[PDB]
Design a protein around this ligand. Structure first.
Ligand SMILES: O=C(NCc1cc[nH]n1)c1cc([C@@H]2CCNC[C@H]2COc2ccc3[nH]ncc3c2)ccc1F
Ligand SMILES: [Mg+2]
Lengths: 618, 339, 57
């Protein structure tokens, strides 16, 4: 049930797989979580030239994360008097003149912003690529990177990889469960959607669009949006793996608590703004902002969820009327009129008034009555003048008079005198105490008797081909904080007992690629022999002893991917009408073996044609 | 024009050579030997079968001890077989998979091979504690190495697909002499017994006789209708035989400067891959693409016997220096010793 | 195309032309005389007993 790393022999096939995609640059490996951890694991222990370069980088990244100026004054002297001043006395300071002048110039004036050592970041990188990055690829740490990268590119999730627990959310198209990923033990939420509930309710467009929207946002680790780590589907369910939020939504808590005060709503307001800022920096309009779509974690902090109605406006702006009645902006209800992020800020003012006075500002149960009352605004006397100024600016009907739509985005709302007391860095760090702390576990804390009588055709399943997805930044972070350390240690022990127990057949020759595959002998006996294959420009050998049999590139006629027992395998056709089927241990291996074998026989057969001694004559 | 004159002059010289040759054909070899008794159905059996070589065999060569032989295979390996016990003495893994030819040195201390890597590799065998490794990589050809043969432990002659041959100083790796003259891929070369001359057959359908020490071409033999794949000297050094894709072997005399005999039959249609003479020069053995080796009477051109082994092309053969046996290499991964 | 190449070809054909040749009857006899002088030293022509034959025991 745990993670098994492949043997280091996986490096041969993986390094070519990555090089065909340009994934072996410094800009692409350094910016990966597991890659950075392994790269520094090499620079700190396995090398002395770049050890002070990385520790300099790590001391700067610590300094960026300092909260107060009182701490930045004490840190800037230490970093300067150690990684700049001491290196400069030994003359081995490999940095430009402008870098030292910028840091020293600020220290004399004693102005220490979190971006003080940013000029060094550009140069520490330049000194780590092209030279130290090449010695790193030779080392055993980059092999370990190939082992881990093979696991990531071989992810195929099903319901059996999660231990599903209680229900924490009920909707019109499915349920949301709290689950644990047994792979690493990370707690998640599972959003299951019924395809048969999707076909009847004509909701095929929403589920498809929700996955696209989750993919745009689930990067960068936003604490105020419910982000996605994986997406998979069973023959009758769609499954999203999302942040765990087992505290109900606000639409439920608003009934149990009543309306919130200005100070209690200020908390929920600030966090929702930072979440909207994250979607707007990624060109996503939510246009469904209502208390039902704001969940609470175990501590009381909130996130935005259900991006089904959100659309992308990075190239073309929407105009259709989509949202919940009472929160839709005036330009949203008007079909034919375009709109951008301005729709969210109006929905915010609707939701924030509902937390203060218990109902939508435009209320008392007819939809057409709400559409008209807000199309073309009185505020109670129990509102502070700063709160009035915020809602008045947020609920302006004209798009040119509405706060947050005047050219600066979310920064305009932050500068409202209603938030004059907040430190938004402390808001982002979730440092402000939430007003309502959810209980230990209630029922239907996220809700709103007919069934169906229909089945799913093959044509409906074709809309869910490209539904599987794995967010790379999420999986690496999940592993880095759980088992990345203890697994590396266990694999180091197994690879050490193997070397202490055991001459390689590939070095010194002209080998292209080597590794493990499984050829089939007698199919009726489910016979699968696992041999170590060596690919040469003219032949393909394998052993288990020295290689006793092989297969020449002249024999190969075609290479085809086929299915054998619900598993993807390679099919080779031989000159004598014979067939030869191989099976790999992972998807990247099968993709790489197929590509290299196709190129090997096509190039060998074209070369033999022009050699009179080797070619075939009548 | 001068280029027109030099073409007409080269044309008249060709006619002059043809007439000078036709002036020496008073009789034929068939008439001269029409009195000696035939050899008589030469029948040989397989005595040893050399098993190994995971793919096709492209070339072999006997050692001067008439006991050890080396072979070059599609599996990128050289194997130095002990023919008396079929024990693999050395198994040399090559740095390149595309190997086409090999050779055993007269002293038995070195072996050489090469191919589409365009390099002749000298592998040493006398270094202490086994581990036979490259002692020199001879680089200079701009085409595939097709054949190579040692003179001594310090000089080796090579033929390549760049339409040239060459003579190397093994100690320094220098290309001492280049033998230009062919207009197609040079395929095979054979050394004269005195090692002062060597012949070479090529894809221009012509063989050529070269002076090793003077580096020039002495005589050029036409006659074949397609590529010349193999060439072998007569035991005394005055004549040689060639094997071609035209399904014929031909005997050429040096002192007569023309062809003497054509070895052909109406049933044989496929081309020849290798040729060799028996010790006395009476028998001409030729490997064919129909998986057979044919034994010819070199003096009467009759077919004596057929070595009917193997299941694919016979790619190489060779007689020992004592004439005790004949080895054959095939595309079916096997070597057989006939006697 | 090359003028120097045409000189080198004409000079080569002169070399191949200005040699001394012999009658085919002479060359054919000398070859026949070699096969006779060594027919008894050829293990393939004249069969050899099993004791002297290294590939049979
Ligand atoms: O079906 C549903 N929505 C329609 C649609 C169409 C396409 N995708 N979704 C739908 C809704 C819900 C609730 C309903 C109330 N408001 C919020 C919304 C989100 O619920 C939660 C609750 C706890 C959570 N922890 N982690 C994530 C998460 C989500 C639940 C299940 C559904 F299938
Ligand atoms: Mg509109």
């Amino acid at each position: 049930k745990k993670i098994l790393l492949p043997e280091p022999s996986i490096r041969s096939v993986m390094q070519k797989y990555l090089e065909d995609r340009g994934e072996v640059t410094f800009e692409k490996i350094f910016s990966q979580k597991l890659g950075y951890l392994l790269f520094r694991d090499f620079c700190l222990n396995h090398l002395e030239e770049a050890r002070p370069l990385v520790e300099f980088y790590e001391e700067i990244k610590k300094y960026e994360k300092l909260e107060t100026e009182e701490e930045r004054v004490a840190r800037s002297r230490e970093i300067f008097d150690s990684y700049i001043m001491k290196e400069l006395l030994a003359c081995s300071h490999p940095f430009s003149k402008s870098a030292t002048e910028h840091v020293q110039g600020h220290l004399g004036k004693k102005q220490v912003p979190p971006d003080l050592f940013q000029p060094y970041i550009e140069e520490i990188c330049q000194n780590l690529r092209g030279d130290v990055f090449q010695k790193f690829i030779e080392s055993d740490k980059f092999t370990r990177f190939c082992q881990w990268k093979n696991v990531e590119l071989n992810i195929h999730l099903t319901m059996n990889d999660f231990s599903v627990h209680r229900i924490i959310g009920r909707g019109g198209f499915g349920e949301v469960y709290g689950c644990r990923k047994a792979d690493t033990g990370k707690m998640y939420a599972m959003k299951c959607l019924d395809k048969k509930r999707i076909k009847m309710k004509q909701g095929e467009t929403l589920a498809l669009n929700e996955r696209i929207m989750l993919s745009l946002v689930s990067t960068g680790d936003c604490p105020f949006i419910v982000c996605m780590s994986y997406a998979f589907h069973t023959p009758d369910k769609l499954s999203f793996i999302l942040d765990l939020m087992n505290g109900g939504d606000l639409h439920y808590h608003l009934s149990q608590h009543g309306v919130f005060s200005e100070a209690d709503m200020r908390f929920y307001a600030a966090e929702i703004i930072l979440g909207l800022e994250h979607m707007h920096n990624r060109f996503v309009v939510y246009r469904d902002l209502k208390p039902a779509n704001i969940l609470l974690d175990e501590h009381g902090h909130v996130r935005i969820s259900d991006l089904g109605l959100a659309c992308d406006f990075s190239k073309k702006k929407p105009h259709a009327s989509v949202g919940t009645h009472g929160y839709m902006a005036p330009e949203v209800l008007q079909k034919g009129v375009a709109y951008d992020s301005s729709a969210d800020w109006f929905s915010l003012g609707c939701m924030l008034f509902k937390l203060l006075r218990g109902h939508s500002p435009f209320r008392t149960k007819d939809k057409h009555e709400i559409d008209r009352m807000t199309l073309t605004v009185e505020l109670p006397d129990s509102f502070s003048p700063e709160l009035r100024s915020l809602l008045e600016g947020l609920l302006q009907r004209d798009v040119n008079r509405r706060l947050g739509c005047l050219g600066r985005g979310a920064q305009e709302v932050k500068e409202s005198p209603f938030f004059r007391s907040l430190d938004w860095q402390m808001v982002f760090l979730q440092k402000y105490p939430p007003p309502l702390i959810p209980p230990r576990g209630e029922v239907n804390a996220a809700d709103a008797e007919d069934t169906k009588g229909i089945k799913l055709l093959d044509s409906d399943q074709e809309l869910y081909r490209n539904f599987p997805l794995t967010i790379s930044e999420r999986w690496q972070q999940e592993v880095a904080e759980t088992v990345f350390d203890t697994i590396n240690a266990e694999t180091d022990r197994l690879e050490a007992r193997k070397k202490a127990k055991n001459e390689d057949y590939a070095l010194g020759k002209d080998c292209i690629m080597h590794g493990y595959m499984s050829k089939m002998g007698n199919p009726f006996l489910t016979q699968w022999q696992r041999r170590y294959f060596y690919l040469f420009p003219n032949r393909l050998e394998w052993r288990g002893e020295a290689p006793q049999s092989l297969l020449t590139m002249e024999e190969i006629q075609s290479v085809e991917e086929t299915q054998i027992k619900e598993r993807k395998c390679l099919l080779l056709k031989i000159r004598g009408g014979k067939q030869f089927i191989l099976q790999c241990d992972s998807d990247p291996e099968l993709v790489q073996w197929k590509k290299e074998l196709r190129d090997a026989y096509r190039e060998a057969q074209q070369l033999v044609q022009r050699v009179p001694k080797m070619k075939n004559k009548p | 024009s001068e280029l027109d004159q030099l073409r007409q002059e080269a044309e008249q010289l060709k006619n002059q050579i043809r007439d000078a040759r036709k002036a020496c054909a008073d009789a034929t070899l068939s008439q001269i030997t029409n009195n000696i008794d035939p050899v008589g159905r030469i029948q040989m059996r397989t005595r040893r079968t050399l098993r190994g070589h995971l793919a096709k065999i492209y070339a072999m060569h006997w050692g001067t001890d008439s006991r050890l032989l080396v072979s070059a295979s599609q599996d990128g390996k050289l194997i130095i077989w002990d023919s008396y016990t079929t024990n693999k003495v050395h198994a040399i893994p090559l740095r390149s998979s595309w190997v086409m030819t090999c050779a055993y040195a007269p002293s038995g201390n070195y072996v050489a091979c090469g191919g589409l890597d365009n390099i002749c590799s000298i592998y040493n065998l006398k270094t202490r504690e086994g581990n036979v490794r490259v002692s020199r990589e001879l680089a200079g050809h701009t085409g595939y190495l097709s054949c190579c043969r040692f003179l001594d432990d310090n000089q080796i002659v090579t033929s390549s697909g760049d339409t040239t041959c060459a003579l190397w100083d093994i100690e320094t790796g220098q290309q001492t002499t280049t033998f230009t003259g062919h207009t197609g891929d040079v395929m095979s070369l054979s050394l004269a017994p005195d090692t002062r001359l060597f012949v070479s057959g090529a894809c221009d359908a012509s063989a050529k006789l070269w002076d090793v020490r003077e580096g020039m071409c002495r005589q050029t033999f036409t006659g074949h209708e397609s590529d010349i794949n193999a060439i072998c000297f007569f035991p005394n050094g005055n004549a040689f035989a060639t094997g071609s894709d035209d399904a014929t072997c031909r005997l050429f005399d040096l002192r007569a400067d023309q062809e003497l005999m054509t070895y052909s039959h109406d049933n044989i249609i496929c081309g020849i891959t290798s040729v060799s003479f028996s010790k006395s020069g009476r028998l001409l053995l030729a490997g064919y693409d129909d998986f057979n080796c044919n034994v010819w009477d070199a003096l009467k051109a009759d077919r004596a016997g057929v070595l009917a082994g193997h299941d694919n092309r016979v790619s190489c053969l060779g007689v020992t220096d004592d004439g005790m046996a004949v080895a054959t290499g095939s595309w079916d991964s096997f070597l057989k010793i006939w006697n | 195309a090359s003028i120097a190449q045409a000189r080198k070809l004409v000079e080569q054909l002169k070399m191949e032309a200005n040699i001394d040749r012999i009658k085919v009857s002479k060359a054919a006899a000398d070859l026949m005389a070699y096969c006779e002088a060594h027919a008894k030293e050829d293990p393939l022509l004249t069969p050899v007993p099993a004791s002297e034959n290294p590939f049979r025991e």
